[PDB]
Amino acid sequence: TVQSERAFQKQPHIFNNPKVKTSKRTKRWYKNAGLGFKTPKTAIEGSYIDKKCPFTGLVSIRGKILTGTVVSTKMHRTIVIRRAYLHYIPKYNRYEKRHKNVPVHVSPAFRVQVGDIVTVGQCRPISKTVRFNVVKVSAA
Amino acid sequence: SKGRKLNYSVQDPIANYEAPITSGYKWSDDQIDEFFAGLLGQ
Amino acid sequence: KSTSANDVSVYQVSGTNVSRSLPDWIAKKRKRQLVELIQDFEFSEASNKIKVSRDGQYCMATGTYKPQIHVYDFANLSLKFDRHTDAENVDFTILSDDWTKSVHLQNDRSIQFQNKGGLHYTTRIPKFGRSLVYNKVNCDLYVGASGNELYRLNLEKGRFLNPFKLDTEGVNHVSINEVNGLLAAGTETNVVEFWDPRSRSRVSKLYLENNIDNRPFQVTTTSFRNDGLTFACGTSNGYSYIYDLRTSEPSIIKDQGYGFDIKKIIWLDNVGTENKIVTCDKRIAKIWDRLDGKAYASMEPSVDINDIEHVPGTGMFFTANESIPMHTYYIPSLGPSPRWCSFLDSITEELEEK
Amino acid sequence: LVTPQRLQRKRHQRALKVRNAQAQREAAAEYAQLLAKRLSE
Amino acid sequence: LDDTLFKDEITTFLTENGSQSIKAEDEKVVMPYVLRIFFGRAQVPPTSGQKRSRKIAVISVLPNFKKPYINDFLSLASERLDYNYFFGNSHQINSSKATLKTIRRMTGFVNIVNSTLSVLRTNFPLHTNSVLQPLIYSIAMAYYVLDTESTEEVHLRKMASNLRQQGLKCLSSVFEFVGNTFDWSTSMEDIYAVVVKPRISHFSDENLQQPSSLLRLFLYWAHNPSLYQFLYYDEFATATALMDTISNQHVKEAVIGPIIEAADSIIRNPVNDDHYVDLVTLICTSCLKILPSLYVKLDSNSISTFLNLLVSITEMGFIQDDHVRSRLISSLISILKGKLKKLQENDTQKILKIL
Amino acid sequence: ARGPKKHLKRLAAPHHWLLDKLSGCYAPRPSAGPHKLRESLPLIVFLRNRLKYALNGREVKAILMQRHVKVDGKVRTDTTYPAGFMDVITLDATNENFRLVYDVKGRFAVHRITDEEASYKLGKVKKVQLGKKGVPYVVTHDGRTIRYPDPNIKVNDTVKIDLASGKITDFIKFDAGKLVYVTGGRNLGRIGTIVHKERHDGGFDLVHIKDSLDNTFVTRLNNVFVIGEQGKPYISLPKGKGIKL
Amino acid sequence: GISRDSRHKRSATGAKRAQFRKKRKFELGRQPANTKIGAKRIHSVRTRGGNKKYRALRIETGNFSWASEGISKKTRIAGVVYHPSNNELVRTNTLTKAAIVQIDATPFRQWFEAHYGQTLGKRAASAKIESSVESQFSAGRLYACISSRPGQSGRCDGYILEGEELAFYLRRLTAKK
RNA sequence: AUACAGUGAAACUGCGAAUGGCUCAUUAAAUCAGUUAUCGUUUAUUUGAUAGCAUGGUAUAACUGUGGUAAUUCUAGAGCUAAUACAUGCUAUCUCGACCCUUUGGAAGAGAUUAUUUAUUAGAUUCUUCGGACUCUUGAUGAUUCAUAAUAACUUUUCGAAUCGCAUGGCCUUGUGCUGGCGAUGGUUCAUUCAAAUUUCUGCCCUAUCAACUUUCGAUGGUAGGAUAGUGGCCUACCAUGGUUUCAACGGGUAACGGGGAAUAAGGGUUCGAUUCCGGAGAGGGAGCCUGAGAAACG
8 Å CB contact between C145 and B1: no
Whether C82 CB is under 7 Å from strand H: yes
Q: What gap in Å lies between CA E111 and CA E100, rounded to an integer?
A: 16
Mind giving me the DSSP string for F29-56? PPPS-SS-STT-EEHHHIIIIIS---SS
Residues 6+ apart with CB under 8 A from G108: G66, G73, G75, G137, G142, G160
Phi-psi region of F95 (alpha: psi -120 to 50; beta: other; left: phi over 0): left
Nucleotide nearest to F1 (CA to C1'): H18
Mention every residue, 6+ apart, whose C-beta is less than 8 A from residue C54. C94, C96, C97, C98
Q: Which residue is nearest to nucleotide H276 (CA to C1')?
A: F11
Length of chain G: 177
Sign of CA dihedral C310, C311, C314, C315: negative
Dihedral, CA of residue C144, residue C146, residue C147 and residue C150, to nearest 10: -20
**Beta-bridge partners for C253:** C241
Which residue is nearest to the C1' sugar atom of H287, using CA? C118
How many helices (H) and strands (E) are present in chain G, helices listed first? 5, 11
Residue C272 backbone phi and psi in degrees, to 5: -125, -25
C1' nearest to CA of G33: which nucleotide? Answer: H226
The one-letter amino acid code at E291 reads: L
The residue range of the domain holding A130 is 1-140
The strands making up G51-59's β-sheet, listed across from edge to edge, are G36-37, G51-59, G41-47
Strand, coil or helix: what is G82? strand
In this structure, how many other beta carbons lie within 10 angstroms of the beta carbon of residue F110? 17
Helix axes E68-80, E24-43, angle to 10 degrees: 40
D19, closest nucleotide (Cα–C1'): H52
The CA distance from A108 to C338, in Å, is: 72
Whole-angstrom distance, CA of residue F226 vs CA of residue G71: 53
**Domain boundaries F1-116, corresponding CATH code:** 3.10.290.10
Cα distance from G168 to chain A (closest Cα, Å)?
Answer: 8
| Partner residue opposite F150 with nearest CB, options D27, D28, D34 | D34
Q: Measured between beta carbons, which residues in chain E are less than 8 angstroms from residue C22?
A: 2
Q: How many helices (H) and strands (E) does chain D have?
A: 1, 0
Alpha helices (runs of H) in E120-236, residue ranges in sequence order: 132-148, 154-178, 188-196, 213-223, 229-233
| Contacts with C250 (C-beta within 8 Å, 6 or more apart), sequence order | C233, C241, C242, C243
Mark E188-202 as b/e (b = at least 16 C-beta within 10 Å): bebbbbbbbebbbee
Other beta carbons within 10 angstroms of residue A36's beta carbon come to 11
Evaluate whether C318 touches C305 at the Cβ level (below 8 Å). Answer: no
Asked whether F109 and F152 are in contact (CB, 8 A), the reply is: no
**Could you tell me the CA-to-CA distances from E240 to A31, E57, E210, E225, E245 in Å, in that order?**
60, 45, 20, 19, 9
Q: How far apart are CA C82 and CA C74, in angstroms?
A: 15
Nearest to C5 by CA among C205, C334, C300, C341: C300
Inter-chain CB proximity F148 and D31 less than 8 Å: yes
DSSP annotation of E10 reads I
Phi-psi region of C253 (alpha: psi -120 to 50; beta: other; left: phi over 0): beta
* CB neighbourhood size of G49 (10 A): 6
Contacts of C352 (CB under 8 A, 6+ apart): C9
Nearest CA among F145, F151, F117, F113 for reference residue F132? F145
DSSP string, C236-288: TTTEEEEE-SS-SSEEEEEE-S-SSPEEEEEEEE-SSSEEEEEEETTTEEEEE
Distances (CA, A) of E61 to C204, D1, E20, E174, F28: 57, 45, 16, 20, 65
Burial class (CB in 10 A: 0-12, 13-18, 19+), G69: middle
Q: Which of residues 22-41 of D touch strand H (CB under 7 A)?
A: 22-25, 27
Shortest CA distance from B16: residue in chain C: C156
Per DSSP, C192 falls in state: E
Distance in angstroms (rounded) separating the CA atoms of residues A115 and A139? 8
Query: Which residue, C26, C62, C7, C46, is CA-closest to C309?
Result: C62
Residues 55-114 in G having a C-beta less than 7 A from any atom of strand H are 55-56, 61, 63, 65, 67, 70-74, 84-86, 96-98
Cβ–Cβ of F152/D38 closer than 8 Å? yes
Interhelix angle E322-337/E300-316, rounded to 10 degrees, is 150
Which nucleotides on strand H sit less than 7 A from a protein beta carbon? Answer: 3, 17-21, 26-28, 30-31, 36-40, 42-52, 54-56, 87, 91-93, 95-99, 108-111, 114-121, 136, 138-145, 147-149, 152-158, 160-161, 163-168, 178-181, 183, 189-203, 213-245, 247, 249-251, 277-282, 285-289, 291-298
Order of strands, sheet of F127-131, starting from the edge strand that comes earlier in the sequence: F127-131, F135-139, F145-147
C9 within 8 A of C333, measured Cβ to Cβ = yes
Q: Could you tell me if A56 and A43 are in contact, meaning their C-beta atoms sit under 8 angstroms apart? A: yes
Distance CA C136, CA C142 (A): 11
Asked if residue C6 lies in contact with residue C300, where contact means CB atoms within 8 angstroms, the answer is: no
* Interchain contact E11–G (C-beta under 8 A): yes
State the Cα torsion F75-F81-F83-F87 to the nearest 10°.
0
Q: CB–CB of C252/C242 below 8 Å?
A: yes
**How was this entry determined?**
cryo-EM
d(CA A35, CA A136): 11
F121-171 CATH: 2.40.50.740
Amino acid letter, residue C279: T
φ/ψ (deg, to 5) at A84: -115, 130
| Phi (first) and psi of residue F108, to 5 degrees | -65, 150
* CA–CA–CA angle C238, C242, C243 (5° rounding): 140
d(CA E279, CA E286): 10
- Report strand pairing: G36-37 vs G51-59: parallel
- Whole-angstrom Cα distance, residue F4 to residue G41? 38
Rounded CA-CA distance E60/G73 in Å is 10
Question: What does residue F161 show for φ and ψ, rounded to 5 degrees?
Answer: -115, 150
User: Which of C120, C146, C118, C117 has the alpha carbon at shortest distance from C132?
Assistant: C146
Q: Would you call A3 and G98 a contact, using CB atoms and an 8 Å cutoff? A: no
Instruction: Quote the minimal CA–CA distance from E66 to chain C in Å.
Output: 25
Strand H reaches within 7 A of the G20 CB? yes
The residue extents of the domains of chain G are 1-30, 31-105+141-177, 106-140
E44 Cα to chain C: minimum distance (Å): 22
B9 touches strand H (CB under 7 A): yes
Burial class (CB in 10 A: 0-12, 13-18, 19+), C337: buried
Provide the terminal-to-terminal Cα distance of chain E, rounded to the nearest Å.
72
- Per CB-CB distance under 8 Å, the chain C contacts of B6 are 126, 149, 151, 160, 163
Can you spell out the DSSP letters for C207-224?
Answer: -----SS-------EEEE
Say if residues C141 and C123 touch (Cβ distance below 8 Å). Answer: no
In this complex, the nucleotide whose C1' atom is nearest to the CA atom of residue E249 is H98
Short-list C150, C132, C47, CA closest to C95: C132
The rounded distance, in Å, linking the Cα atoms of A134 and C266 is 65
Report CA-CA distances (Å) from E321 to E284, E327, E328, G151: 11, 10, 10, 79
Q: How far out from the chain centre does Cα F130 lie?
A: 25
10 Å Cβ neighbour count for A119? 17
Chains touching C, CB cut-off 8 Å, 3+ pairs: B, E, G
Kindly calculate the radius of gyration of chain G based on its CA atoms and give it in whole angstroms.
21
Cα–Cα nearest to E39, from E102, E115, E101 = E115
Distance, CA of B26 to CA of C274 (rounded, Å): 21
Instruction: Give the amino acid at G36.
Output: K
Rounded distance, CA F242 to CA C254, Å? Answer: 104
User: Is any atom of strand H within 7 angstroms of residue G39's beta carbon?
Assistant: no
Strands of the sheet containing F179-182, edge to edge, are F215-220, F206-211, F191-197, F179-182, F224-228
Helix (H) or strand (E) holding E282: helix E276-290
**Cα distance between residue A99 and residue C94, in whole Å:** 58
Cα separations in angstroms, E257 against E172, E211, E225, E295, G74: 19, 9, 21, 13, 40
Indicate if the alpha-carbon torsion angle A52, A55, A58, A59 is positive or negative. Answer: positive
Radius of gyration (Cα) for chain F, nearest Å? 19
Residues of F in contact with A62 (CB under 8 A): 202
Domain ranges, ordered by start, for chain F? 1-116, 121-171, 174-244
Q: Where are the alpha helices (DSSP H) in G4-105?
A: 87-91
DSSP E48-76: SHHHHHHHHHHHHHTTSS-SHHHHHHHHH
Measured CA distances, F222 to C317, F39, F109, F182 (Å): 76, 14, 22, 9
- Look at G61 and E120 and tell me if their CB atoms are within 8 Å: no
CA B41 centroid distance within chain: 23
Measured CA to CA, the distance from residue F48 to residue F52 in angstroms comes to: 5
Residue C56 falls in which region: left (phi positive, over 0), alpha (psi -120 to 50) or beta: left
Taking the alpha carbons of C156, C159, C161, C167 in that order, is the dihedral positive or negative? positive
- DSSP letters, C60-74, are EEEETTTTEEEEEET
Q: Which residues lie across from C134 on neighbouring strands?
A: C141
CB atoms within 10 A of CB F46: 23
CB neighbours (10 Å) of residue E311?
A: 16
Rounded CA-CA distance E81/E106 in Å is: 7
Rounded-to-integer distance, Cα G82 and Cα G46, Å: 33
Provide Rg for chain E, Cα atoms.
Answer: 25
Query: At C144, which helix (H) or strand (E)?
Result: strand C140-145
- CA end-to-end span of chain B: 45
**Taking the C-alpha atoms of E66, E69, E72 and E73 in order, what is their torsion angle to the nearest 10 degrees?**
-110
Q: How close E51 gets to chain C, by Cα (Å)?
A: 20
* Cα separation, G64 vs G73, whole angstroms: 6
| DSSP string over C79-107 | EEEEEE-SS-EEEEEE-SSSTTEEEEEET
Relative orientation angle of helices E132-148 and E154-178, to the nearest 10 degrees: 150
Q: Is A93 left (phi over 0), alpha (psi -120 to 50) or beta?
A: left
Q: Cβ distance C177 to C161 under 8 Å?
A: no
**Cβ burial F151-175 (10 Å sphere, 16+ → b, else e):** eebeebbbbbbebeeeebeebbebe
* CB contact burial C174-202 (16+ within 10 A = b; e otherwise): bbbbeebbbbbbbbbbbbbbbbbbeeeee
Q: Check G76 against E18: CB less than 8 A apart.
A: yes
Instruction: Quote the CA–CA distance of E261 and E283 in Å, as a whole number.
Output: 12
Distance E253 CA to H182 C1' (A): 57
Contact in structure between C68 and C45 (CB atoms under 8 Å): no
Q: Does domain G106-140 have CATH number 3.40.50.2000?
A: no
- Contacts of residue E270, defined as CB under 8 A and 6 or more positions apart, other chains included, come to E276
Calculate the dihedral angle through the C-alpha atoms of F10, F12, F14, F17, rounding to the nearest 10 degrees: 10
The answer to whether G73 and G64 have CB atoms below 8 angstroms apart is yes
CB pairs under 8 A between C and G: 28
C187-190, Cβ contacts within 8 angstroms, sequence gap of 24 or more: C187/C219, C188/C216, C188/C217, C188/C218, C188/C219, C188/C235, C189/C216, C190/C216, C190/C217, C190/C219
The CATH number assigned to the domain with range F174-244 reads 2.30.30.30
Q: Do G6 and A128 touch (CB under 8 A)?
A: yes
Give the one of E4, E13, E20 whose C-beta lies nearest to C26's C-beta. Answer: E4
Which residue out of A19, A80, A126, A127 would a mutagenesis test of the G interface target, given it has the greatest number of G Cβ atoms within 10 Å? A19
Answer yes or no: are the C-beta atoms of G35 and G95 closer than 8 Å. Answer: yes
3-state secondary structure of F196: strand
Nearest nucleotide, CA F201 to C1': H142
From CA C64, how far away is CA F54, in angstroms rounded? Answer: 66
Q: Are C105 and C94 in contact (CB under 8 A)?
A: no
Helix (H) / strand (E) element for B31: namely none
Cα angle E281-E284-E287, degrees, rounded to a multiple of 5: 165
Q: Is C42 helix (H, G, I), strand (E, B) or coil?
A: coil
Taking the C1' atom of H234, which residue's CA lies nearest?
G4
| C327 within 8 A of C2, measured Cβ to Cβ | no
- In angstroms, the CA of C69 and the C1' of H68 are apart by 38
Contacts of G164 in chain A (CB under 8 A): 18
Residue nearest to nucleotide H200 (CA to C1'): A64
CA distances from F68 to F52, F62, F87 (A): 16, 10, 16
Spatial strand order in the sheet of G79-82: G71-76, G61-66, G157-159, G141-146, G99-104, G79-82
- In total, the C-beta contacts within 8 angstroms joining chain C to chain E are 8
- Judge: D38–F151 Cβ closer than 8 Å, yes or no: yes
What is the 8-class DSSP label of residue E12? I
- Which residues in chain C have Cβ-Cβ distances shorter than 8 Å to G60? none
A69, exposed or middle or buried, with CB in 10 Å at 0-12, 13-18, 19+? middle
Of F202, F201, F136, F144, the closest CA to residue F168 belongs to F144
Please tell me which of the candidates G2, G38, G58 has its beta carbon nearest to residue C86: G2
A15 with G12: Cβ contact below 8 A: no
Does the nearest atom of strand H lie within 7 Å of A14's Cβ? yes
Backbone angles phi, psi at E241, to 5 degrees: -65, -40
Q: Under an 8 A CB cutoff, do E12 and G40 touch?
A: no
Tell me which DSSP letter residue G88 carries. H
> Distance (Å, rounded) from C-alpha A91 to C-alpha G141?
79
| E9 touches C: beta carbon within 8 Å | yes
